[PDB]
Amino acid sequence: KGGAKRHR
Amino acid sequence: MASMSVSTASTEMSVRKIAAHMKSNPNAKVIFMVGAGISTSCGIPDFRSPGTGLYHNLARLKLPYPEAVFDVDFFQSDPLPFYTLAKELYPGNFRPSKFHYLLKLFQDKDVLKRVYTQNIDTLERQAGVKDDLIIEAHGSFAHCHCIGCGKVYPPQVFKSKLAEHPIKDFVKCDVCGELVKPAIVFFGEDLPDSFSETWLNDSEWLREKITTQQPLVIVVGTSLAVYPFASLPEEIPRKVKRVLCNLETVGDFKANKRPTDLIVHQYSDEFAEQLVEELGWQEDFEKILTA
Ligand SMILES: Nc1ncnc2c1ncn2[C@@H]1O[C@H](COP(=O)(O)OP(=O)(O)OC[C@H]2O[C@@H](O)[C@H](O)[C@@H]2O)[C@@H](O)[C@H]1O
Ligand SMILES: [Cl-]
Ligand SMILES: [Zn+2]
């Protein structure tokens, strides 16, 4: 699903 | 809304191609993926920029670094910086840009398939884009929720506290007592289910169109540095033309450029002006802007 909001 | 070109180089020819593609595929639709760049002309202050009152207010409140304002752990330890940011950036304090209205125009012309936005200003919706066509990947201030149990709350109680001087006694859940906050996605939090669900559907939609109305995906004003939103460009089918309207070449357009990729270094509002010109929808567009 993409995972949690983050950089990289 | 007045705009000008970013440099002496003309982007009209590049924009011409986009209009040409749409003219060749009249029954086609476009998917937009947008970021903070499309709202800069609206005057929204960048919380990461030292030139803004917002940045300095947050610094004075002892925020460690800009993005901590969107950090769950920090929020729980000190909600004031976020409340301060919310007071200044609450939706309704600004007005849509010419580009936001372009989305509305495309909707009116029935050539808008979807607009995926990572912005939390809600300007696409404020400009008239229908709920069914908008995917607010990072949430919005339309709803509030308890960070503990998830109980939903109307947005008004939180908003009402932003008008108090000073801001204190932050909103707490009447069930578990934890902090309540606008339904904005903070770093470390998962995005709403509708993001992945709709992209799954639009992905199949894109692929099925390839084998015949060839679609178009236009990425505008985003640095593609925040995931999973940033994963969308690379996931676009190779056989689906990608367009990037951004002051700089970023993300997958930089890392893995595709032969058909069209890069347009231009301000989003100028891009809108030029695209409407090439499409010949100046009249309808003028009506929207004056409306
Ligand atoms: N008028 C404009 N027209 C076209 N592109 C523009 C314009 N103004 C800025 N840009 C480009 O838009 C991008 C904006 O990048 P960001 O400011 O990082 O914002 P965005 O990617 O959407 O990210 C948001 C970030 O804000 C915070 O919510 C969260 O911290 C996150 O890191 C940049 O690549 C920039 O070159
Ligand atoms: Cl369709
Ligand atoms: Zn609760």
Coordinates of N, CA, C and O in Angstrom, one line a residue, chain B residues 55-232:
Chain B
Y55 N 7.2 30.6 9.8 CA 8.4 30.0 10.2 C 9.0 30.6 11.5 O 9.4 29.8 12.4
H56 N 9.0 31.9 11.6 CA 9.5 32.5 12.8 C 8.7 32.3 14.1 O 9.2 32.1 15.2
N57 N 7.3 32.2 13.9 CA 6.5 31.9 15.0 C 6.8 30.5 15.5 O 6.9 30.3 16.7
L58 N 6.9 29.6 14.6 CA 7.2 28.2 14.9 C 8.6 28.1 15.6 O 8.7 27.3 16.6
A59 N 9.5 28.8 15.1 CA 10.9 28.8 15.7 C 10.8 29.4 17.1 O 11.5 28.8 18.0
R60 N 10.1 30.4 17.3 CA 10.0 31.0 18.6 C 9.3 30.1 19.6 O 9.5 30.1 20.8
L61 N 8.4 29.2 19.1 CA 7.7 28.3 19.9 C 8.5 27.1 20.2 O 8.1 26.1 20.8
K62 N 9.8 27.1 19.8 CA 10.8 26.1 20.0 C 10.6 24.8 19.2 O 11.1 23.7 19.6
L63 N 10.0 24.9 18.0 CA 9.8 23.7 17.2 C 11.3 23.4 16.7 O 12.0 24.3 16.3
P64 N 11.7 22.1 16.8 CA 13.1 21.7 16.5 C 13.5 21.9 15.0 O 14.6 22.3 14.7
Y65 N 12.6 21.6 14.1 CA 12.8 21.8 12.7 C 11.4 21.8 12.1 O 10.4 21.3 12.7
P66 N 11.2 22.5 10.9 CA 9.9 22.6 10.3 C 9.0 21.4 10.2 O 7.8 21.5 10.7
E67 N 9.4 20.3 9.7 CA 8.6 19.1 9.6 C 8.1 18.5 10.9 O 7.2 17.6 10.9
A68 N 8.6 18.9 12.0 CA 8.2 18.4 13.3 C 6.8 18.8 13.6 O 6.1 18.3 14.4
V69 N 6.3 19.9 12.8 CA 5.0 20.4 13.0 C 4.0 19.3 12.5 O 2.8 19.4 12.9
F70 N 4.5 18.4 11.7 CA 3.6 17.3 11.1 C 4.1 16.0 11.7 O 4.1 15.0 11.0
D71 N 4.6 16.0 12.9 CA 5.2 14.8 13.5 C 4.2 14.4 14.7 O 4.0 15.2 15.6
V72 N 3.7 13.2 14.7 CA 2.8 12.7 15.7 C 3.4 12.8 17.1 O 2.7 13.3 18.0
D73 N 4.6 12.2 17.3 CA 5.2 12.2 18.6 C 5.4 13.6 19.1 O 5.2 13.9 20.3
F74 N 5.9 14.5 18.2 CA 6.1 15.9 18.7 C 4.8 16.6 19.0 O 4.6 17.2 20.0
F75 N 3.7 16.3 18.2 CA 2.4 16.9 18.4 C 1.9 16.5 19.8 O 1.4 17.4 20.6
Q76 N 2.0 15.3 20.1 CA 1.5 14.8 21.4 C 2.3 15.4 22.6 O 1.8 15.7 23.7
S77 N 3.6 15.7 22.4 CA 4.4 16.3 23.4 C 4.2 17.8 23.5 O 4.4 18.5 24.5
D78 N 3.8 18.4 22.4 CA 3.5 19.9 22.3 C 2.7 20.2 21.1 O 3.2 20.4 20.0
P79 N 1.4 20.3 21.3 CA 0.5 20.7 20.2 C 0.4 22.1 19.7 O -0.1 22.4 18.6
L80 N 1.0 23.0 20.5 CA 0.9 24.5 20.1 C 1.5 24.8 18.7 O 0.8 25.6 18.0
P81 N 2.7 24.3 18.4 CA 3.2 24.7 17.1 C 2.2 24.3 15.9 O 1.9 25.1 15.1
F82 N 1.6 23.1 16.0 CA 0.7 22.7 15.0 C -0.6 23.6 15.0 O -1.1 24.0 14.0
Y83 N -1.1 23.9 16.2 CA -2.3 24.8 16.3 C -2.0 26.1 15.7 O -2.8 26.7 15.0
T84 N -0.7 26.6 15.9 CA -0.3 27.9 15.4 C -0.3 27.8 13.8 O -0.7 28.8 13.2
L85 N 0.2 26.7 13.3 CA 0.3 26.6 11.8 C -1.2 26.5 11.3 O -1.5 27.0 10.2
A86 N -2.0 25.7 12.0 CA -3.4 25.6 11.5 C -4.1 26.9 11.5 O -4.9 27.1 10.6
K87 N -3.9 27.8 12.4 CA -4.5 29.1 12.5 C -4.2 29.8 11.2 O -5.1 30.5 10.6
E88 N -2.9 29.8 10.8 CA -2.5 30.5 9.6 C -2.9 29.9 8.3 O -3.2 30.5 7.3
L89 N -2.8 28.5 8.2 CA -3.1 27.8 7.0 C -4.5 27.2 6.9 O -4.8 26.5 5.9
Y90 N -5.4 27.5 7.8 CA -6.7 26.9 7.7 C -7.4 27.2 6.4 O -7.4 28.3 5.9
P91 N -7.9 26.2 5.7 CA -8.6 26.3 4.4 C -9.6 27.4 4.5 O -10.4 27.6 5.5
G92 N -9.7 28.2 3.4 CA -10.7 29.3 3.4 C -10.0 30.7 3.6 O -10.5 31.7 3.4
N93 N -8.7 30.6 4.0 CA -7.9 31.8 4.2 C -7.3 32.3 2.9 O -6.8 33.4 2.9
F94 N -7.3 31.5 1.9 CA -6.7 31.8 0.6 C -7.7 31.6 -0.5 O -8.8 31.1 -0.2
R95 N -7.3 31.9 -1.7 CA -8.2 31.7 -2.9 C -7.4 30.9 -3.9 O -6.2 31.0 -4.0
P96 N -8.1 30.1 -4.7 CA -7.6 29.2 -5.7 C -6.8 30.0 -6.8 O -7.0 31.2 -7.1
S97 N -5.7 29.3 -7.3 CA -4.9 29.9 -8.4 C -5.5 29.7 -9.7 O -6.4 28.9 -9.8
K98 N -4.9 30.3 -10.7 CA -5.4 30.1 -12.1 C -5.3 28.6 -12.5 O -6.1 28.0 -13.2
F99 N -4.2 27.9 -12.0 CA -4.1 26.5 -12.2 C -5.2 25.7 -11.6 O -5.7 24.8 -12.2
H100 N -5.6 26.1 -10.4 CA -6.6 25.3 -9.7 C -7.9 25.4 -10.6 O -8.6 24.5 -10.7
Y101 N -8.1 26.6 -11.1 CA -9.3 26.8 -12.0 C -9.2 26.0 -13.3 O -10.2 25.6 -13.9
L102 N -8.0 25.7 -13.7 CA -7.8 25.0 -14.9 C -8.3 23.5 -14.7 O -8.9 22.9 -15.6
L103 N -8.1 23.0 -13.5 CA -8.6 21.7 -13.1 C -10.1 21.7 -13.3 O -10.7 20.8 -13.8
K104 N -10.8 22.8 -12.8 CA -12.2 23.0 -12.9 C -12.7 23.0 -14.4 O -13.7 22.5 -14.7
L105 N -11.9 23.7 -15.2 CA -12.2 23.8 -16.6 C -12.1 22.4 -17.3 O -13.1 22.1 -18.0
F106 N -11.1 21.7 -17.0 CA -11.0 20.3 -17.5 C -12.2 19.5 -17.1 O -12.6 18.6 -17.8
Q107 N -12.6 19.7 -15.9 CA -13.8 19.0 -15.3 C -15.0 19.3 -16.2 O -15.7 18.5 -16.6
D108 N -15.2 20.6 -16.4 CA -16.3 21.1 -17.2 C -16.3 20.5 -18.6 O -17.3 20.2 -19.2
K109 N -15.1 20.4 -19.2 CA -14.9 19.8 -20.5 C -14.9 18.3 -20.5 O -14.7 17.6 -21.5
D110 N -15.1 17.7 -19.3 CA -15.1 16.3 -19.0 C -13.8 15.6 -19.5 O -13.9 14.5 -20.0
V111 N -12.7 16.2 -19.3 CA -11.4 15.6 -19.6 C -10.6 15.4 -18.4 O -9.4 15.2 -18.5
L112 N -11.2 15.5 -17.2 CA -10.5 15.3 -16.0 C -10.9 13.9 -15.4 O -12.0 13.6 -15.1
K113 N -9.9 13.0 -15.3 CA -10.1 11.7 -14.8 C -10.0 11.7 -13.3 O -10.8 11.1 -12.5
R114 N -8.9 12.4 -12.8 CA -8.7 12.4 -11.4 C -7.6 13.4 -11.1 O -6.7 13.7 -12.0
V115 N -7.5 14.0 -9.9 CA -6.4 14.9 -9.5 C -6.0 14.3 -8.1 O -6.8 14.3 -7.2
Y116 N -4.7 13.9 -8.1 CA -4.1 13.4 -6.9 C -3.3 14.5 -6.3 O -2.5 15.1 -7.0
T117 N -3.6 15.0 -5.1 CA -2.9 16.1 -4.5 C -2.3 15.8 -3.2 O -2.9 15.0 -2.4
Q118 N -1.1 16.3 -3.0 CA -0.5 16.0 -1.7 C -0.6 17.3 -0.8 O -0.2 17.3 0.3
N119 N -1.3 18.3 -1.3 CA -1.5 19.5 -0.6 C -2.7 19.4 0.4 O -3.6 18.6 0.2
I120 N -2.6 20.2 1.5 CA -3.7 20.1 2.5 C -4.4 21.4 2.5 O -5.1 21.7 3.5
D121 N -4.3 22.2 1.5 CA -5.0 23.5 1.4 C -6.5 23.4 0.9 O -7.2 24.3 1.1
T122 N -6.8 22.2 0.3 CA -8.1 22.0 -0.2 C -8.5 22.9 -1.3 O -9.7 23.1 -1.5
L123 N -7.6 23.6 -1.9 CA -7.9 24.5 -3.0 C -8.5 23.9 -4.2 O -9.2 24.6 -5.0
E124 N -8.3 22.6 -4.5 CA -8.9 22.0 -5.7 C -10.4 22.0 -5.5 O -11.2 22.4 -6.3
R125 N -10.8 21.5 -4.3 CA -12.2 21.4 -3.9 C -12.8 22.8 -3.8 O -13.9 23.0 -4.2
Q126 N -12.0 23.8 -3.2 CA -12.6 25.1 -3.1 C -12.8 25.8 -4.5 O -13.7 26.6 -4.6
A127 N -12.0 25.3 -5.4 CA -12.2 25.9 -6.8 C -13.3 25.2 -7.6 O -13.6 25.7 -8.7
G128 N -14.0 24.2 -7.0 CA -15.1 23.6 -7.7 C -14.9 22.2 -8.2 O -15.8 21.6 -8.8
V129 N -13.7 21.6 -8.0 CA -13.5 20.2 -8.5 C -14.3 19.3 -7.6 O -14.4 19.4 -6.4
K130 N -15.1 18.4 -8.3 CA -15.9 17.5 -7.6 C -15.2 16.5 -6.7 O -14.1 16.0 -7.0
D131 N -15.9 16.2 -5.6 CA -15.4 15.2 -4.6 C -14.9 13.9 -5.3 O -13.9 13.3 -4.9
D132 N -15.7 13.4 -6.2 CA -15.4 12.1 -6.9 C -14.1 12.2 -7.7 O -13.4 11.1 -7.8
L133 N -13.7 13.3 -8.1 CA -12.5 13.5 -8.9 C -11.2 13.8 -8.1 O -10.1 13.9 -8.7
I134 N -11.3 14.1 -6.9 CA -10.2 14.5 -6.0 C -9.7 13.4 -5.1 O -10.5 12.8 -4.4
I135 N -8.4 13.3 -5.0 CA -7.8 12.4 -4.0 C -6.9 13.2 -3.2 O -5.8 13.6 -3.7
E136 N -7.3 13.5 -2.0 CA -6.5 14.3 -1.1 C -5.6 13.3 -0.3 O -6.0 12.8 0.7
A137 N -4.5 13.0 -0.9 CA -3.6 12.0 -0.4 C -3.1 12.2 1.0 O -2.8 11.2 1.8
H138 N -3.0 13.4 1.4 CA -2.6 13.7 2.8 C -3.6 14.3 3.7 O -3.4 14.9 4.7
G139 N -4.9 14.0 3.4 CA -6.0 14.4 4.2 C -6.4 15.9 4.0 O -5.9 16.5 3.1
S140 N -7.2 16.4 4.9 CA -7.6 17.8 4.9 C -8.2 18.2 6.3 O -8.1 17.4 7.2
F141 N -8.7 19.4 6.4 CA -9.3 19.9 7.6 C -10.8 19.7 7.6 O -11.5 20.3 8.5
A142 N -11.3 19.0 6.7 CA -12.7 18.8 6.6 C -13.3 17.9 7.7 O -14.5 18.0 8.1
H143 N -12.4 17.1 8.4 CA -12.8 16.3 9.5 C -11.7 16.3 10.6 O -10.6 16.7 10.3
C144 N -12.1 15.9 11.8 CA -11.1 15.8 12.9 C -11.2 14.4 13.4 O -12.3 13.8 13.3
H145 N -10.2 14.0 14.1 CA -10.3 12.6 14.7 C -9.4 12.5 15.9 O -8.4 13.3 16.0
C146 N -9.7 11.6 16.8 CA -8.9 11.4 18.0 C -7.7 10.5 17.5 O -7.8 9.5 16.9
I147 N -6.5 11.0 17.9 CA -5.3 10.2 17.5 C -5.1 8.9 18.3 O -4.3 8.1 18.0
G148 N -6.0 8.8 19.3 CA -5.9 7.6 20.2 C -6.9 6.5 19.8 O -6.5 5.4 19.4
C149 N -8.2 6.8 19.8 CA -9.2 5.8 19.5 C -9.8 6.0 18.1 O -10.5 5.1 17.6
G150 N -9.6 7.2 17.5 CA -10.1 7.4 16.2 C -11.5 8.0 16.1 O -12.1 8.1 15.0
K151 N -12.1 8.3 17.2 CA -13.5 8.8 17.2 C -13.4 10.0 16.3 O -12.5 10.9 16.4
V152 N -14.5 10.2 15.4 CA -14.5 11.3 14.5 C -15.2 12.5 15.2 O -16.2 12.3 15.9
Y153 N -14.8 13.7 14.8 CA -15.3 14.9 15.4 C -15.6 15.9 14.3 O -14.9 15.9 13.2
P154 N -16.6 16.8 14.4 CA -16.8 17.8 13.4 C -15.6 18.7 13.5 O -15.0 18.8 14.5
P155 N -15.2 19.3 12.4 CA -14.1 20.2 12.4 C -14.2 21.5 13.2 O -13.2 22.2 13.5
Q156 N -15.4 21.9 13.4 CA -15.7 23.2 14.1 C -15.1 23.4 15.5 O -14.6 24.6 15.8
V157 N -15.1 22.4 16.4 CA -14.5 22.7 17.7 C -13.0 23.0 17.7 O -12.6 23.9 18.3
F158 N -12.3 22.3 16.8 CA -10.9 22.5 16.7 C -10.7 23.9 16.1 O -9.9 24.7 16.6
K159 N -11.4 24.2 15.0 CA -11.3 25.5 14.4 C -11.6 26.7 15.4 O -11.0 27.7 15.4
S160 N -12.6 26.5 16.2 CA -13.0 27.5 17.2 C -11.8 27.8 18.2 O -11.7 29.0 18.6
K161 N -11.0 26.8 18.5 CA -9.9 27.1 19.5 C -8.8 27.9 18.9 O -8.0 28.5 19.6
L162 N -8.7 27.9 17.5 CA -7.7 28.7 16.8 C -7.9 30.2 17.0 O -7.0 31.0 16.7
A163 N -9.1 30.6 17.3 CA -9.4 32.0 17.5 C -9.2 32.6 18.9 O -9.4 33.8 19.1
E164 N -8.8 31.7 19.8 CA -8.6 32.1 21.2 C -7.2 32.7 21.4 O -6.3 32.2 20.8
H165 N -7.1 33.7 22.3 CA -5.8 34.3 22.6 C -5.6 34.3 24.1 O -6.3 35.0 24.8
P166 N -4.6 33.5 24.6 CA -3.8 32.6 23.7 C -4.4 31.3 23.5 O -5.4 31.0 24.1
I167 N -3.8 30.5 22.6 CA -4.4 29.2 22.3 C -3.9 28.2 23.4 O -2.7 28.0 23.6
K168 N -4.8 27.6 24.1 CA -4.5 26.7 25.2 C -5.7 25.7 25.4 O -6.7 25.8 24.8
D169 N -5.4 24.7 26.3 CA -6.5 23.7 26.6 C -6.9 23.1 25.3 O -8.1 23.1 24.9
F170 N -5.9 22.5 24.6 CA -6.2 21.8 23.3 C -7.3 20.8 23.4 O -7.5 20.2 24.4
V171 N -7.9 20.6 22.2 CA -9.0 19.6 22.2 C -8.7 18.2 22.5 O -7.7 17.7 21.9
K172 N -9.4 17.6 23.4 CA -9.1 16.2 23.8 C -10.4 15.4 23.5 O -11.5 15.9 23.6
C173 N -10.2 14.1 23.2 CA -11.3 13.2 22.9 C -12.2 12.9 24.2 O -11.7 12.7 25.3
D174 N -13.5 13.0 24.0 CA -14.4 12.8 25.1 C -14.6 11.3 25.5 O -15.4 10.9 26.3
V175 N -13.8 10.4 24.8 CA -13.9 9.0 25.1 C -12.6 8.5 25.8 O -12.7 8.0 26.9
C176 N -11.5 8.7 25.1 CA -10.2 8.3 25.7 C -9.3 9.4 26.2 O -8.2 9.1 26.8
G177 N -9.6 10.6 26.0 CA -8.8 11.7 26.5 C -7.6 12.2 25.7 O -6.8 13.1 26.1
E178 N -7.3 11.5 24.6 CA -6.1 11.8 23.8 C -6.4 13.0 22.9 O -7.6 13.5 22.8
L179 N -5.4 13.6 22.3 CA -5.6 14.8 21.4 C -6.4 14.5 20.2 O -6.2 13.5 19.5
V180 N -7.2 15.5 19.8 CA -8.0 15.4 18.6 C -7.3 16.4 17.6 O -6.9 17.5 18.0
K181 N -7.2 16.0 16.3 CA -6.6 16.9 15.3 C -7.3 16.8 14.0 O -8.0 15.8 13.7
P182 N -7.1 17.7 13.1 CA -7.7 17.7 11.8 C -7.2 16.4 11.1 O -6.1 16.0 11.3
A183 N -8.0 15.9 10.2 CA -7.7 14.6 9.5 C -6.6 14.8 8.5 O -6.8 14.4 7.3
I184 N -5.5 15.4 8.9 CA -4.3 15.6 8.0 C -3.4 14.5 8.3 O -3.2 14.1 9.4
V185 N -2.7 13.9 7.2 CA -1.8 12.9 7.4 C -0.4 13.4 7.9 O 0.2 14.2 7.1
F186 N 0.0 13.0 9.0 CA 1.3 13.4 9.6 C 2.4 12.4 9.1 O 2.1 11.3 8.8
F187 N 3.6 12.8 9.2 CA 4.7 11.9 8.8 C 4.6 10.8 9.8 O 4.5 11.0 11.0
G188 N 4.7 9.6 9.3 CA 4.7 8.4 10.2 C 3.3 7.8 10.2 O 3.1 6.7 10.7
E189 N 2.3 8.5 9.7 CA 0.9 8.0 9.6 C 0.6 7.5 8.2 O 1.2 7.9 7.3
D190 N -0.3 6.5 8.2 CA -0.7 5.9 6.9 C -1.7 6.9 6.2 O -2.4 7.6 6.8
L191 N -1.7 6.8 4.9 CA -2.6 7.6 4.1 C -4.0 7.0 4.1 O -4.1 5.8 4.4
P192 N -5.0 7.8 3.8 CA -6.3 7.2 3.8 C -6.4 6.1 2.8 O -5.8 6.1 1.7
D193 N -7.3 5.1 3.1 CA -7.4 3.9 2.2 C -7.8 4.3 0.8 O -7.4 3.6 -0.2
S194 N -8.5 5.4 0.6 CA -8.9 5.8 -0.7 C -7.8 6.1 -1.7 O -7.9 6.0 -2.9
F195 N -6.6 6.4 -1.2 CA -5.5 6.7 -2.0 C -5.1 5.5 -2.8 O -5.1 5.5 -4.0
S196 N -4.6 4.4 -2.1 CA -4.2 3.2 -2.7 C -5.4 2.6 -3.5 O -5.1 2.1 -4.6
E197 N -6.6 2.6 -3.0 CA -7.7 2.0 -3.7 C -8.0 2.7 -5.0 O -8.2 2.0 -6.0
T198 N -8.0 4.0 -5.0 CA -8.3 4.7 -6.3 C -7.2 4.6 -7.3 O -7.4 4.6 -8.5
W199 N -5.9 4.6 -6.8 CA -4.8 4.5 -7.7 C -4.8 3.1 -8.3 O -4.4 2.9 -9.5
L200 N -5.3 2.1 -7.6 CA -5.4 0.7 -8.1 C -6.3 0.7 -9.3 O -6.1 0.2 -10.3
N201 N -7.5 1.4 -9.1 CA -8.5 1.5 -10.1 C -8.0 2.3 -11.3 O -8.2 1.9 -12.5
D202 N -7.4 3.5 -11.1 CA -6.9 4.3 -12.1 C -5.8 3.7 -12.9 O -5.5 4.0 -14.0
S203 N -5.0 2.8 -12.2 CA -3.9 2.1 -12.8 C -4.4 1.2 -13.9 O -3.9 1.1 -15.0
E204 N -5.5 0.5 -13.6 CA -6.1 -0.5 -14.5 C -6.7 0.3 -15.6 O -6.6 0.0 -16.8
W205 N -7.3 1.4 -15.3 CA -8.0 2.3 -16.2 C -6.9 2.8 -17.3 O -7.2 2.8 -18.5
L206 N -5.8 3.2 -16.8 CA -4.7 3.7 -17.7 C -4.2 2.6 -18.6 O -4.2 2.8 -19.8
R207 N -4.0 1.4 -18.1 CA -3.5 0.3 -18.9 C -4.5 -0.2 -19.9 O -4.1 -0.5 -21.1
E208 N -5.8 -0.2 -19.6 CA -6.8 -0.6 -20.5 C -7.0 0.4 -21.7 O -7.3 0.0 -22.8
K209 N -6.7 1.7 -21.4 CA -6.8 2.7 -22.5 C -5.7 2.5 -23.5 O -5.9 2.8 -24.7
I210 N -4.5 2.0 -23.0 CA -3.4 1.9 -23.9 C -3.7 1.0 -25.1 O -3.4 1.4 -26.3
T211 N -4.5 -0.1 -24.9 CA -4.9 -1.0 -26.0 C -6.2 -0.5 -26.6 O -7.0 -1.3 -27.0
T212 N -6.4 0.8 -26.6 CA -7.6 1.5 -27.1 C -8.8 0.7 -26.7 O -9.2 0.8 -25.5
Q213 N -8.2 7.5 -27.7 CA -8.4 8.1 -26.4 C -7.2 7.8 -25.5 O -7.4 7.5 -24.3
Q214 N -6.0 7.9 -26.0 CA -4.8 7.6 -25.2 C -4.8 8.7 -24.1 O -4.8 9.9 -24.3
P215 N -4.7 8.2 -22.8 CA -4.6 9.1 -21.6 C -3.4 10.0 -21.5 O -2.5 9.9 -22.4
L216 N -3.3 10.8 -20.5 CA -2.2 11.7 -20.3 C -2.1 11.9 -18.8 O -3.2 12.0 -18.1
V217 N -0.9 11.8 -18.2 CA -0.7 12.0 -16.8 C 0.2 13.2 -16.7 O 1.3 13.2 -17.2
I218 N -0.3 14.3 -16.0 CA 0.4 15.5 -15.9 C 0.8 15.7 -14.4 O -0.1 15.9 -13.6
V219 N 2.1 15.8 -14.1 CA 2.6 16.0 -12.7 C 3.0 17.4 -12.6 O 3.8 17.9 -13.4
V220 N 2.4 18.2 -11.7 CA 2.7 19.6 -11.5 C 3.0 20.1 -10.1 O 2.3 19.8 -9.1
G221 N 4.1 20.9 -10.0 CA 4.5 21.5 -8.8 C 4.7 20.6 -7.5 O 4.3 20.9 -6.4
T222 N 5.4 19.5 -7.7 CA 5.8 18.6 -6.6 C 7.2 18.2 -6.7 O 7.7 18.0 -7.8
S223 N 7.9 18.1 -5.6 CA 9.3 17.7 -5.6 C 9.4 16.2 -5.5 O 10.5 15.7 -5.6
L224 N 8.3 15.5 -5.5 CA 8.3 14.0 -5.4 C 9.3 13.5 -4.4 O 10.0 12.6 -4.7
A225 N 9.2 14.1 -3.2 CA 10.1 13.7 -2.1 C 9.4 13.1 -1.0 O 10.0 12.7 0.0
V226 N 8.1 13.0 -1.0 CA 7.3 12.4 0.0 C 6.6 11.2 -0.5 O 5.8 11.2 -1.4
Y227 N 6.9 10.0 0.2 CA 6.3 8.8 -0.2 C 5.2 8.4 0.8 O 5.1 8.9 1.9
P228 N 4.2 7.6 0.4 CA 4.2 6.9 -0.9 C 3.6 7.7 -2.1 O 3.6 7.2 -3.2
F229 N 3.2 8.9 -1.9 CA 2.7 9.7 -3.0 C 3.7 9.8 -4.1 O 3.3 9.7 -5.3
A230 N 5.0 9.9 -3.8 CA 6.0 10.0 -4.8 C 6.2 8.8 -5.6 O 6.9 8.8 -6.7
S231 N 5.6 7.7 -5.2 CA 5.7 6.4 -6.0 C 4.8 6.4 -7.2 O 5.1 5.6 -8.1
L232 N 3.9 7.3 -7.3 CA 2.9 7.3 -8.4 C 3.5 7.5 -9.8 O 3.2 6.7 -10.7

